[PDB]
């Protein structure tokens, strides 16, 4: 989803203060819920590089 | 108290210029060094724009919250911190008018 | 439409055009203020010029300056560009330049603002972690959730009060 | 146009 | 250990002195080492002569003649180290001899006037401007000439261009649009390209016939005959064409300007310009530029040839007259000297400007010294260039290599007058001519790409900044050891071949062998091969040459590799690569890392701080060793002695090792045994798994040092004292604050401990009514001073190692105004590698540590030795740098064979040679195994089964034989470590070099809860100790907008950044476990409305029914 | 001429100061330390005086100025703010006033409010502090109430952690 | 896209996707058939010529040297059909085969680029966008505000609806479907707030002010500033 | 992921509605006293330093844990706006 590799990439982090902001955040913004992309009905939680390599062999 | 549901830009009536304003800035007196205080009536005067200190007044006749909405007898200071000093408006009264370049130099001269 | 003409010039608040003490004892003020003086000085010299007696050429001459000045604060550069004295041939930010400008108001009103409960570090793969969660450095968490912690310190015996709980972690 | 010239011309 | 090196291409000549670019330029620049008698008069002496003869004649009384004699600069005010301890700019003093003449009897000579303190160069090539060593990076641009480029929009015909730099100085162009006009433009407007020739003396008849008989375009020249029939009158006529309303009479004034002195450049009267001439167009030069003032009648051997070639270029093949701008023979490289000499002469003009005013101010004759000279201009001028130039920068000594490359890189941007920000892609691309002159890899990533790049190996700036790449001569089928440093341009006239060509000595060996004419690959015959490439090395830069098998790595990723080295941090356990290219030695040597022995002798004393050697000449000198010094970027620089007591030294042998050298060889990171397979996810996209074992030994460990500084300022409220006194709460925190005020050396400082104490006053001008009560309640008599004490910023500190305090009676130091006194605190800290760090090999595999595994369970080989790091395979296919995979293989060999090797650039080791060493290795590995008493595992056999089923081992051969095969392939059997079972399938392993990368300031994971706020904009701001908030950009807004994150977005716009009343109630609410409040209006909004009201416009918010509502809570209603 | 008005005398003063620095630049080759200027100027000139005048001589700086790499940097965002209670302070006033308010009530609204109001309400007068009752009852209840208040606040430690 | 040189006919990659969202006259356009009829071609040396005709009328089409013709002497050509080879200007196709055609062309012509580059994004999105490129039209038969004015399509469906259904007097508000670039579509919109953001903060306001504009907050940009 | 998020999604007419419900339920859970719940007895909310989640860890983790059950009622206009806060203070103690 985020185009991030570990060659030194750095991510920021924010905090939901209201009980509402939290509500939305963990309801409709939490990762484990948005699995299929808005661009295509194709998943985005696809087994990336290493996982396939394993499952393939 | 009520939700802001519509914003509106409209022209400024000179009488509305004055309505928003407090006092007239009538002299190019910023602040005079000896005392880093506002010079005379000038750009920073406390009457024109507001006091520079918390709940307290300029001279200190009234100093806490009990009387939060009243003004001082000999000097004018109604208070809640200097945010007032940053939101208040003052106006300059022009001798012989001049015109807004915003309306005179846009491609279609709105006045032309 | 009679309002397009100007005879009453609104002046922007003071704290928004600060006068401040810097390093060594340097000072710093919003360019707007030099422009304001421009106008006020001219406007006053005008009044006194009318009162003293009035030779035509000189009164217009001033009225011209005056006009120009009234442009300056509103928008600089549409007609000539005002300069602070020899040091920086820089357009004194005109009220306009404040709104639009290179890096103005509506502009940077959308470039970004800084969040209060934010943080940022290097990232690193978390294999065992589940999609659900994420690994966050406690050391970061502490500052991030400081107030949420403070109070929770008071709910437990770790600290008597907030200010305490604060110094406890300073 | 440019302000110096005009006044100069004006009183001169 | 033994060294075996594979490739054989006779390296004919050693690499040049790696800093000559910087060293020699400043040498010719300021020719001060040699008397004014010596001939090299470019630079300073030149710039001097250029503006010294100040002729001021008439307007009142004049006849002024101030003349230059000799330039002499000699005794440095202070020395290098002192210049760094104290804030100082190491500069030499200069005062040249001056004598002013008079029209009345008398010539007063006021010998010296020291104006301008000009910086000097360190023996390495770097400077010392203010505290930090700085460097002047070279540049590029259109070398002052004349070219003809195709016309803009009309497909038709091209136009001519005459390029004269300085800026002040015309810019000509010749264009013909035949319905009735011709166009020659100096400043802007156009006119006929003949009225001028006529002025000079070229008449329609002699001109048209000799010049364009072969060129019919002559007809446009003799066209307006009415004016062509009056000579000297044409002079006045053109004057008239210019436009001010000028006096028709001015005998030979403006003609002079485009004549001899100023505008046309005063560069070399032989090559600086006349080179671009005789070869490109025309032939001679009768004075520097088109110049003469002897008879009033001017001579122009340049104005006719330009049109001569336009008539020639337009009409056929005199030659093929099309100039590719990007040819390096068109682009010059400004060496340091030029860059300084220019600012030096800019100053000379500023100086000469004010002096002219004083030829009139001084009463009578005594006006030589002070009347004519004021040092204010030259100082400011030159000073500005070394401290404020966009080109001079902090030395990048993250490690010597870095400090060197940074010394020798070449930039685009700068003066602005050579190449600003707009024009790009044609310049940014790697032009053909860039060969051996510029690296094609070196330039940095990001917008600023290709514009900034360090030169190549054998690249050298000849006479005028033109990178000549060397190429050896080959007469017939014979190749020579003779070399010609050729200009970009001439390179095209010949048929050049590559070094890879099978050579018998002087004999080429294959009939159809590759060569490349002019930017075009061409298979030529041995008989056509005019010239040959010098070396593989010259093709790239130093920084790049250090890569093992560059040959097998995608030029793209090889860039990363080259820039990675520039980010190498010195480890307290340097190690040369198990496999090197061949320049590690030369790098450390040419860089000034290690300390070499001048002449042969024996050693006397070997201190940890000095090695006083005794030369056989009967002399002995003490060689100090920068114990522990602070690099600009905070990396340690120590010289560790490698010579024992009483040792006969060969001339030029390492006495001590530099910051990162093992044994005279460059060493960063440390060759580590590595397995190259997938681990759980610990190495997933670009993650690296590390063996705890690496930390057991102080392997990747590095010493840092940050320099915290605090000042005792003078407030009108009262001086800020620096004392052990910390007004409000504990002695516990005052311990390490041992010295009254300063902290004790060698004290371990953690985040939040006082490093230094200071006391300033409480309010702005008045005391506090509320604080008045409290103080009185428990202790009225209280020091009303405020704790403003330098503390340990979050992040980290180590142990204090040095401190500096400068009080009232200053020795010879510069204390800024208001600054009562300063207090420096140098802290040091050991950085043992950990999960947050990033390491990367020379190839480009960059990545971060994701997990430090217990030696207990990571991949272990059959004999108990386990792997240090486990690299993910997947990172290799996509990227294309098999060279690392090649390194690991040779590495494995060196591990068992206990030897290091040197694989050159493209001539190095070959796949068969490595398979050969692997063979030898199988015997050390498995031979001892045989004798030690045991054979093969069930495991070892099992993996073999799966290996033949794979196709890595010839079915039917004995395990012993099979494993040899399998090893030769570079892979061995590895057991899990966690289970002890084998890892189905052989896995390669080996000695790969890997460095650790420097941790930037940003790295220091920030994190802010609440903190300061800007004064005018009310958004969160950091600085010293409060971290400062993160930016929530539009792209991020949308992210939320897209989600149904309404509140979360409001928050980010209100409570978290601008809601003044919001953030406050926010905090408090949270504090009282109160669910946060509902957002008030943002100051962004308010600031706007008012900014908006500042202009006539009135913005009023409205209600349900169009009615008011109020944003500004209660402060806008009046009174 | 100046943004911060300067009297004619200070003006000429500054001119004389400048002029003098000029004649001093003439020979030293050393931009005079504020020692020369004092001397050359005249009767009552000292280092503190000149350092002060030249500080007032420097006109201000544009709060809005291009900074660092002029790409898009505006100077006025970097200055922090002082009157405004950074959250930390708002929380302070909350607990402080709530706890100060609890103690003020469980007592005598006599010498406690006197010193609470005299010190926390108007301005910083033992005698002029109490209404009709003289000094002896002031010191009496001030010091006895102030200490019972402090010593029980020592028991239930709420105040100890210096809110400042 | 492309460069002026001999005959560079199309535009690939992003450059195109710009040429599409922003209605633009391609480098190598393709004259469309304003008329749906039959084809006819001619021989003379300099310029070619294709003529489309029905039993009603015929139309002359100037096809210079570079134009490679897709059509042949003989068959039918629907309105807005490619008569030249290559790119099509959306305004013209709008005029010729209607909006439906333009919209349908835009979408599919846009996907042409991404599809060719591996990306598989749902049409939906491009549609949402294009729609907005036609949120406005042109006027030719007034009622409330004078004729030449470009205004929001649905806002006229507002006027026309109530002017013929609730309040009598059928004053038909005759308009002309207008297609405008994505940039312009937004550059000029209902709420000035939004327009102040990007266009000419200086002008956007001036107008919005004079007219006393009530920005009904809908849309996230404008309501975010608040 | 989270417990029966599908089940939850299905119980609402709009995704964004489910968010408002949970958030407002979590609100009330804390304000009126945290014992304002419908399912505490046998199998309820739980954390492990002890089994103490029974008192006050995560508000909405509860809200959702109740909503998943069929005891709560969310409407567009179920009970008049101000009389709700009054009847709730009257019946739920803990302050
Ligand atoms: Mg990355
Ligand atoms: Zn008062």
């Amino acid at each position: 989803a985020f185009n991030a590799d570990f060659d030194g990439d750095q991510m920021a982090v924010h905090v939901p203060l209201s009980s509402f902001a939290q509500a939305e955040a963990r309801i409709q913004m939490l990762s484990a819920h948005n699995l299929l992309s808005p661009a295509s009905g194709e998943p985005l939680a696809k087994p990336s590089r290493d996982i396939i390599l394993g499952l393939y062999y | 108290k009520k939700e802001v549901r519509k914003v509106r830009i409209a022209l400024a009536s000179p009488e509305k210029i004055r309505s928003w304003s407090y006092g007239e800035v009538e002299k190019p007196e910023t602040i005079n060094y000896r005392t880093l205080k506002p010079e005379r009536d000038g750009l920073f005067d406390e009457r024109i724009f507001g006091p520079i200190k918390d709940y307290e007044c300029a001279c200190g006749k009234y100093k806490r919250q009990r009387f939060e909405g009243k003004v001082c007898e000999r000097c004018g200071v109604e208070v809640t911190k200097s945010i007032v000093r940053r939101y208040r408006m003052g106006h300059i009264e022009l001798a012989t008018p001049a015109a807004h370049i915003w309306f005179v130099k846009d491609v279609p001269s709105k006045i032309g | 439409p009679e309002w397009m003409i100007l005879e009453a010039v609104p002046v922007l608040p003071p704290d928004l055009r600060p006068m401040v003490q810097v390093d060594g004892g340097r000072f710093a003020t919003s360019d707007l203020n030099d422009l304001y003086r421009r106008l006020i000085n001219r406007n006053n010299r005008l009044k006194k010029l009318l009162a003293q007696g009035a030779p035509e050429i000189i009164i217009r001459n001033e009225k011209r300056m005056l006009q120009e000045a009234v442009d300056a604060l509103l928008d600089n550069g549409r007609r000539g560009a005002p300069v602070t004295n020899p040091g920086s041939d820089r357009p004194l930010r005109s009220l306009t330049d404040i709104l639009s400008g290179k890096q103005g108001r509506f502009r940077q009103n959308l470039l970004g603002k800084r969040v209060d409960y934010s943080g940022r570090s290097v990232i690193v793969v978390g294999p065992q972690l589940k999609l659900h969660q994420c690994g966050l450095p406690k050391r970061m968490a502490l500052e991030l959730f400081k107030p949420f912690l403070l109070k929770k310190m008071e709910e437990k015996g770790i600290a008597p009060n907030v200010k305490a709980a604060r110094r406890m972690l300073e | 146009k440019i302000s110096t010239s005009d006044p100069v011309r004006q009183y001169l | 250990m033994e060294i075996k090196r594979f490739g054989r291409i006779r390296e004919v000549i050693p690499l040049p002195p790696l800093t000559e670019i910087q060293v020699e330029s400043y040498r010719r620049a300021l020719q001060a080492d040699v008397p004014p008698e010596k001939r090299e008069n470019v630079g300073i002496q030149a710039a001097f002569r250029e503006t010294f003869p100040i002729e001021e004649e008439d307007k009142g009384k004049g006849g002024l003649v101030l003349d230059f004699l000799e330039y002499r600069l000699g005794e440095p005010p202070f020395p290098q180290d002192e210049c760094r301890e104290k804030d100082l700019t190491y500069q030499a003093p200069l005062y040249a001899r001056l004598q002013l003449i008079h029209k009345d009897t008398g010539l007063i000579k006021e010998d010296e006037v020291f104006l301008g303190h000009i910086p000097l160069m360190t023996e390495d090539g770097s400077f010392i401007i203010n505290g930090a060593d700085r460097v002047i990076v070279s540049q590029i641009h259109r070398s002052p000439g004349v070219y003809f480029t195709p016309d803009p929009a009309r497909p038709g015909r091209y136009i001519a261009s005459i390029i004269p730099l300085p800026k002040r100085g015309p810019w000509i162009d010749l264009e013909v649009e035949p319905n009735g006009v011709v166009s020659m433009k100096v400043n802007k407007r156009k006119f006929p390209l003949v009225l001028l020739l006529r002025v000079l003396g070229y008449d329609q008849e002699t001109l048209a016939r000799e010049l364009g008989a072969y060129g019919e375009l002559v007809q446009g020249l003799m066209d307006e005959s009415v004016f062509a029939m009056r000579p000297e009158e044409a002079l006045i006529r053109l004057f008239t064409l210019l436009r001010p309303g000028d006096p028709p009479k001015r005998d030979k004034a403006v003609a002079y300007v485009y004549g001899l002195i100023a505008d046309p450049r005063r560069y070399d009267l032989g090559e600086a310009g006349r080179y671009k001439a005789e070869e490109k167009l025309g032939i001679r030069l009768s004075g520097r530029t088109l110049a003469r003032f002897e008879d009033g009648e001017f001579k122009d051997e340049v104005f006719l040839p330009t049109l001569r070639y336009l008539f020639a270029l337009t009409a056929g093949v005199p030659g093929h007259e099309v100039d590719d701008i990007d040819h390096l023979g068109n682009r010059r490289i400004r060496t340091v000297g030029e860059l300084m000499t220019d600012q030096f002469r800019v100053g000379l003009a500023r100086l000469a400007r004010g002096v002219r005013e004083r030829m009139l101010m001084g009463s009578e004759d005594s006006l030589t010294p002070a009347k004519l000279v004021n040092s204010r201009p030259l100082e400011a001028a030159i000073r500005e260039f070394f401290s404020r130039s966009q080109l001079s920068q902090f030395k990048d000594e993250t490690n010597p290599l870095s400090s060197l490359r940074h010394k020798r890189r070449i930039s685009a941007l700068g003066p602005g007058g050579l190449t600003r920000e707009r024009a790009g892609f044609d310049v940014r691309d790697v032009h053909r001519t860039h060969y051996g002159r510029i690296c094609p890899v070196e330039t940095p990533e990001g917008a600023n790409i290709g514009l900034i790049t360090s030169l190549a190996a054998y690249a050298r700036v000849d006479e005028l900044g033109f990178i000549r790449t060397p190429y050896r001569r080959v007469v017939g089928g014979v190749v020579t050891d003779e070399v010609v440093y050729m200009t970009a341009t001439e390179e095209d006239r010949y048929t050049i071949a590559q070094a890879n060509t099978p050579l018998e000595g002087n004999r080429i060996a294959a009939e159809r062998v590759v060569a490349r004419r002019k930017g075009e690959p061409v298979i030529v015959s041995p008989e056509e091969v005019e010239f040959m490439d010098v070396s593989p090395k010259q093709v790239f830069s130093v920084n790049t040459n250090l890569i093992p098998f560059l040959e097998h790595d995608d030029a793209n990723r090889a860039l990363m590799g080259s820039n990675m080295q520039t980010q190498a941090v010195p480890l307290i356990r340097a190690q040369a690569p198990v496999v090197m290219t061949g320049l590690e030695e030369r790098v450390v040597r040419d860089s000034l890392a290690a300390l070499y022995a001048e002449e042969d002798g024996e050693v006397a004393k070997v201190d940890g701080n000095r090695i006083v050697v005794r030369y056989e000449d009967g002399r002995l000198v003490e060689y100090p060793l920068r114990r522990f010094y602070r690099s600009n970027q905070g990396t340690a620089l120590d010289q560790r002695p490698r010579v024992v007591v009483g040792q006969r030294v060969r001339k030029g042998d390492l006495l001590a090792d530099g910051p990162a050298s093992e044994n005279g060889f460059l060493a960063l990171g440390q060759n580590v045994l590595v397995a190259i397979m997938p681990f759980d996810g610990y190495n997933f996209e670009d993650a690296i798994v590390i063996s705890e074992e690496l930390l057991k030994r102080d392997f990747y460990t590095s010493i840092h040092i940050e320099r915290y500084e605090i000042e005792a300022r003078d407030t009108k409220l009262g001086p800020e004292r620096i004392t052990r006194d910390i007004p409000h709460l504990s002695e516990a925190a005052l311990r390490d604050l041992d010295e009254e005020g300063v902290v004790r050396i060698g004290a371990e400082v953690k985040p939040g401990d006082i490093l230094v104490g200071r006391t300033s006053f409480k309010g702005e001008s008045e005391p506090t009514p509320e604080e008045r009560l409290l103080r009185s309640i428990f202790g009225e008599k209280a020091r009303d001073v405020k704790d403003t004490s330098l503390r340990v910023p979050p992040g980290e500190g180590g142990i204090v190692v040095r401190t500096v305090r400068l009080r009232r009676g200053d020795p010879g130091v510069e204390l800024k105004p208001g600054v009562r006194e300063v207090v420096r605190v140098y802290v040091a800290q050991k950085r043992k590698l950990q999960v947050g760090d990033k390491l990367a090999n020379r190839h480009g595999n960059k990545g971060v540590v994701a997990k430090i595994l217990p030696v207990e369970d990571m991949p272990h080989l059959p004999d108990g030795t386990p792997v240090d790091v486990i690299l993910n395979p997947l990172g290799v296919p996509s990227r294309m740098n098999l060279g690392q995979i090649l390194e690991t293989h040779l590495g494995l060999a060196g591990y068992f064979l206990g030897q290091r090797y040197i694989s050159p650039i493209f001539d190095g080791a070959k796949e068969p040679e490595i398979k050969e060493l692997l063979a030898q290795a199988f015997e050390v590995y498995f031979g001892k195994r045989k004798g030690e008493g045991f054979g093969v595992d069930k495991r070892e056999v099992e993996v073999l089964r799966r290996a033949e089923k794979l196709g890595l081992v010839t079915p039917g051969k004995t395990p012993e034989e099979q494993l040899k095969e399998l090893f030769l392939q570079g892979k061995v059997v590895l057991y899990d470590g966690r289970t002890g079972e084998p890892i189905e399938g052989p896995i390669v392993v080996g000695q790969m070099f890997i460095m650790k990368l420097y941790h930037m300031v940003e790295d220091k994971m920030h994190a802010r809860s609440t903190g300061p706020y800007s004064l005018i904009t009310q958004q969160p701001l950091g600085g010293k100790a409060q971290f400062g908030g993160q930016r929530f950009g539009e792209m991020e807004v949308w992210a939320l907008e897209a989600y149904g994150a309404a509140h979360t977005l409001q928050e980010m716009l209100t409570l978290k950044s601008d809601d003044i009343e919001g953030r406050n109630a926010a905090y408090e609410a949270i504090i009282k476990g109160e669910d946060v409040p509902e957002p008030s209006v943002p100051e962004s909004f308010r600031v706007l409305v008012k900014e908006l009201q500042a202009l006539a416009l009135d913005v009023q918010t409205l209600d349900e029914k169009d009615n008011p509502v109020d944003i500004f809570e209660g402060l806008a209603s009046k009174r | 001429a100046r943004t911060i008005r300067i009297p004619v005398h200070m003006v000429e003063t500054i001119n004389k100061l400048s002029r003098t620095a000029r004649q001093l630049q003439q020979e030293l080759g050393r931009e005079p330390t504020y020692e020369e200027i004092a001397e050359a100027m005249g009767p009552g000139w000292d280092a503190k005086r000149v350092e002060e005048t030249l500080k007032i001589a420097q006109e201000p700086v544009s709060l809005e100025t291009p900074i660092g790499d002029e790409k898009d940097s505006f100077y006025g965002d970097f200055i922090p703010d002082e009157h405004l209670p950074s959250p930390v302070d708002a929380a302070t006033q909350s607990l402080l006033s709530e706890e100060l308010e609890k103690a003020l009530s469980k007592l005598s609204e006599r010498e406690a409010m006197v010193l609470k109001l005299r010190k926390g309400l108007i301005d910083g007068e033992e005698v002029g502090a109490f209404f009709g009752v003289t000094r002896e009852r002031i010191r009496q209840i001030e010091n006895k109430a102030l200490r019972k208040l402090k010593y029980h606040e020592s028991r239930t430690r709420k105040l100890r952690d210096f809110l400042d | 896209t492309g460069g002026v040189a001999g005959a560079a006919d199309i535009t690939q990659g992003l450059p195109r996707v710009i040429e599409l969202f922003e209605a633009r006259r391609p480098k190598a356009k393709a004259v469309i058939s304003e008329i749906d009829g039959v084809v006819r071609i001619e021989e003379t040396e300099e310029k070619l010529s294709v003529f489309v005709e029905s039993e009603g009328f015929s139309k002359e089409y100037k096809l210079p040297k570079e134009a490679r013709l897709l059509v042949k002497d003989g068959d039918y050509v629907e309105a807005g059909q490619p008569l030249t080879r290559g790119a099509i200007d959306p305004h013209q196709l709008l005029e010729a085969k209607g909006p439906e055609a333009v919209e349908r062309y835009l979408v599919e012509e846009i996907q042409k680029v991404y599809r060719a580059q591996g990306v598989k994004l749902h049409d939906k999105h491009i549609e949402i966008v294009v729609r907005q490129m036609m949120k406005y039209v042109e006027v030719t038969d007034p009622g409330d505000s004078r004729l030449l004015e470009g205004q929001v399509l649905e806002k006229w469906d507002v006027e026309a609806l109530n002017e013929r259904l609730i309040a009598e007097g059928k004053t038909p508000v005759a308009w002309k479907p207008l297609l405008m670039g994505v940039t312009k579509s937004a550059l000029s919109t209902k709420s000035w707030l939004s327009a102040a953001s990007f266009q000419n903060t200086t002008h956007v306001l001036t107008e919005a002010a004079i007219a006393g504009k009530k920005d009904e907050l809908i849309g996230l940009k404008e309501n975010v500033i608040l | 992921a989270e417990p029966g998020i599908d089940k939850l999604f299905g119980m609402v007419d709009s995704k964004y509605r489910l968010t408002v419900v949970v958030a407002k339920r979590a609100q009330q859970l804390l304000r009126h006293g945290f014992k304002n719940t419908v399912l505490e007895p046998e199998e309820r909310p739980k954390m492990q330093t002890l089994e103490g989640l029974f008192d006050d860890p995560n508000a909405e983790t509860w809200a959702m844990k109740e909503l998943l059950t069929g005891r709560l009622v969310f409407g567009e206009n179920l009970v008049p706006e101000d009389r709700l806060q009054k009847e709730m203070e009257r019946i739920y103690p803990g302050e």
Side-chain angles (χ1 to χ4, degrees), chain A residues 5 7-9:
Chain A
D5 104 316
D7 61 30
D9 272 336

PDB file of all heavy atoms in Angstrom, chain A residues 5 7-9, ligand 1:
ATOM      1  N   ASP A   5      10.126   0.646   1.172  1.00  0.00           N
ATOM      2  CA  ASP A   5      11.109  -0.422   1.298  1.00  0.00           C
ATOM      3  C   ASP A   5      12.030  -0.051   2.449  1.00  0.00           C
ATOM      4  O   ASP A   5      12.013   1.112   2.866  1.00  0.00           O
ATOM      5  CB  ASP A   5      11.864  -0.602  -0.043  1.00  0.00           C
ATOM      6  CG  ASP A   5      13.286  -0.026  -0.040  1.00  0.00           C
ATOM      7  OD1 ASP A   5      13.480   1.094   0.464  1.00  0.00           O
ATOM      8  OD2 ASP A   5      14.215  -0.699  -0.563  1.00  0.00           O
ATOM      9  N   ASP A   7      15.253   0.707   2.905  1.00  0.00           N
ATOM     10  CA  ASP A   7      16.611   1.174   2.696  1.00  0.00           C
ATOM     11  C   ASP A   7      16.777   2.517   3.425  1.00  0.00           C
ATOM     12  O   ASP A   7      17.546   3.390   3.036  1.00  0.00           O
ATOM     13  CB  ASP A   7      16.963   1.288   1.170  1.00  0.00           C
ATOM     14  CG  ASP A   7      16.073   2.314   0.335  1.00  0.00           C
ATOM     15  OD1 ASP A   7      15.575   3.345   0.860  1.00  0.00           O
ATOM     16  OD2 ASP A   7      15.887   2.086  -0.886  1.00  0.00           O
ATOM     17  N   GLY A   8      16.023   2.675   4.507  1.00  0.00           N
ATOM     18  CA  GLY A   8      16.106   3.897   5.274  1.00  0.00           C
ATOM     19  C   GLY A   8      14.833   4.698   5.220  1.00  0.00           C
ATOM     20  O   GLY A   8      14.801   5.858   5.647  1.00  0.00           O
ATOM     21  N   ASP A   9      13.776   4.105   4.696  1.00  0.00           N
ATOM     22  CA  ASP A   9      12.559   4.853   4.643  1.00  0.00           C
ATOM     23  C   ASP A   9      12.111   5.150   6.033  1.00  0.00           C
ATOM     24  O   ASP A   9      12.434   4.413   6.945  1.00  0.00           O
ATOM     25  CB  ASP A   9      11.510   4.076   3.866  1.00  0.00           C
ATOM     26  CG  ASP A   9      11.590   4.358   2.373  1.00  0.00           C
ATOM     27  OD1 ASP A   9      12.108   5.444   2.022  1.00  0.00           O
ATOM     28  OD2 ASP A   9      11.143   3.514   1.552  1.00  0.00           O
TER      29      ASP A   9
HETATM   30 MG1  LIG I   1      13.326   3.228   0.959  1.00  0.00          MG
END
